[PDB]
Design a protein around this nucleic acid. Structure first.
Lengths: 57, 52, 88, 117, 104
RNA sequence: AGUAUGGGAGAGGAUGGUAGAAUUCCAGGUGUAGCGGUGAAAUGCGUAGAGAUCUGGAGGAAUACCGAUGGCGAAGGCAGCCAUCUGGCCUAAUACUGACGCUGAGGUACGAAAGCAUGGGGAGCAAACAGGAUUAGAUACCCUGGUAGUCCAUGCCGUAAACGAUGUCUACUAGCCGUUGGGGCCUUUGAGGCUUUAGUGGCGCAGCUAACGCGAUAAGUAGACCGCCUGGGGAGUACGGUC
């Protein structure tokens, strides 16, 4: 009702960031090969596992 | 778990209709697979929306 | 496919002794029945390469059991191949 | 002639350019504006300020129809999307709601190749 | 020789005659051997999205045992009946006789 | 090593049907000057009216979220939902056959993408090709279009950094920490803890190695059978032969 337009825009930006809609279009901008997709996913998984192990230890 | 249980399904469905990852839902793998199959059957039968 | 009843009937027909399930005759009869059953499937599906490998495995296993039985006892082997119509 | 109290404004934001169009409900357009229209021709079209001036022009055009409240729909990733809504608020229209209508395919067509720039 | 769950969505305009088609299908199933383990009417509801520009429809559920020929005939009838928009046939192993949810 | 009966997990394979998102096109309504693209441009496109938005229809291809150092397959590989046909694997104690095993020259089957032959299909992308740009030059990188092909049916071709750059099979040899499918045991108030089995990962003793490094998924300690190497280039080339 009385919420400022700027505050509403900031809330909408945060909601969109949580949704992750923009990342889908960023990915869709260009085609990618399975060869690169596998390497990207493997590297991400390795990095996440290493970080988790470092935190645990 | 079955397709008809919309109340249970909505908990693991997001607001936008995206299925929630097992990372957030803290679920077992077999449960997650059954859950996703149930969600897809439900949105085929038009008990929940694919998007929005 | 093949039910449990038909397999029970072949086991009963070819059982050398009571409860005998692992005899060469029983195994060869079961393999022959399964192979003949799959013949219907492979005409309706010519390019199902992944199941033809299992069919080949069944054929090889039957050949091995038949050769072993021939080595063990010639008369039994003759009787079995005559009963089941196997050329060799 | 016709005056409508309710409005809906679509902000099409793209890397090359940004566009704003104000329509009535049911989708009949009233006024439109572009970065190129208010000068700012060239690579400057992508600058957010061009979006601000375009939004100002669109609001001034819509003032004739006199819709005091408008929904806002933003489509596409581009600079100046925030600037467009800020300009609309400065103009003074009441925003009923703001939503993102950007489409996400379910693995449809093949996109073009990557660029070795 | 198998159990199946049948989900049918039927047009509200033709929902007036549903008692006829359900009985006809029951008779057809009973013709061969027949096993209608469960038959439920969910009630008129609103489709989540418009199906052929129909915003609401009626939901029918049937847990049945029947032969393969009966399965094919039922599928053909469902396909060729216009009032039935959208059907689902799911093979299940063992019987469900307890009253299902959403039928209250 | 194998068989029968009970239970389990899986994008394993073949056929058919069907759902939704998005793109391209076609047709109707609102309405006026740009749209598009790049490092900046320009080609291209727009007042026989575009772009934008809504509405309705046609068609092709591919399955967002789930999705994972996850799963299945001999390998190559496999992902929307439903039905039918169908191969393997894991799991408990009994019952049954009684060495029926391992390997394997020749031989044979399968085998990514591209390419070839007949018929069909053709949305998006795109070798060749046309044009616009940058450049001393542009034959390319960038941009505007675009054909074969990418798709379906029926055959052929037999090649990859077809890689773990590590042939198959069997037994033994400190430990610590994960994960997937099963079995068993103890707590309890229903979820936890322990052990075992078949897979899939991270550290690491001895041992091995020129070093890097491997380390119960060995590249350690031993056995069985096979393929392959003998300085670099000429050269996987010439002649002959098979397809």
């Amino acid at each position: 009702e009385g919420e400022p337009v700027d505050v509403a825009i900031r809330r909408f930006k945060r909601s969109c960031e949580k949704a992750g809609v923009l990342a889908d279009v960023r990915k869709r901008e260009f085609y990618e090969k399975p060869t690169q997709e596998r390497k990207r996913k493997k590297a991400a998984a390795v990095k996440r596992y290493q970080k988790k192990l470092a935190r645990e230890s | 778990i079955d397709y008809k249980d919309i109340d249970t399904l909505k908990q693991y469905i997001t607001e936008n209709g995206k299925i929630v990852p097992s990372r957030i839902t803290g679920t077992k793998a077999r449960y997650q697979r059954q859950l996703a199959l149930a969600i897809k059957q439900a949105r085929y039968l038009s008990l929940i929306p694919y998007t929005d | 496919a093949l039910t449990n009843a038909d397999r029970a009937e072949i086991i009963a027909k070819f059982a050398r002794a009571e409860n005998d399930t692992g005899s060469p005759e029983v195994q060869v009869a079961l393999l022959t029945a399964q192979i003949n059953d799959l013949q219907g499937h492979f005409k309706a599906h010519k390019h199902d390469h992944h199941s033809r490998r299992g069919l080949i495995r069944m054929v090889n296993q039957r050949r091995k059991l038949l050769d072993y039985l021939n080595g063990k006892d010639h008369e039994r082997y003759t009787a079995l191949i005559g009963a089941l119509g196997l050329r060799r | 002639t016709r005056t409508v109290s309710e409005g809906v404004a679509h902000i099409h934001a793209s890397f090359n350019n940004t566009i704003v169009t104000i329509t009535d409900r049911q989708g009949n357009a009233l006024a439109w504006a572009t970065s190129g229209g208010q000068g700012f021709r060239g690579s400057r079209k992508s600058t957010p300020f061009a979006a601000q001036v375009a939004a100002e022009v669109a609001g001034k055009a819509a003032l004739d129809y006199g819709l005091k409240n408008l929904d806002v729909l933003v489509k596409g990733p581009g600079p100046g999307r925030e600037s467009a809504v800020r300009a609309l608020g400065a103009v003074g229209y009441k925003i009923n709601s703001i939503t993102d209508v950007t489409p996400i395919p379910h693995n449809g067509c093949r996109p073009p190749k990557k660029r070795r720039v | 020789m198998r159990h199946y769950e049948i989900v049918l969505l039927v047009h509200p305009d033709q929902s007036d005659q549903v008692v006829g088609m359900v009985e006809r299908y029951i008779s057809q199933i009973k013709e061969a051997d027949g096993q209608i383990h469960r038959l439920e009417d969910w009630g008129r509801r609103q489709l989540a999205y418009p199906i052929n520009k129909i915003h609401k429809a009626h939901y029918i559920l049937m847990n049945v045992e029947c032969g393969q020929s009966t399965l094919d005939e039922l599928e053909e009838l469902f396909r060729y009946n216009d009032a039935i928009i959208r059907n689902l046939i799911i093979r299940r192993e063992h019987a469900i006789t307890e009253e299902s949810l959403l039928a209250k």
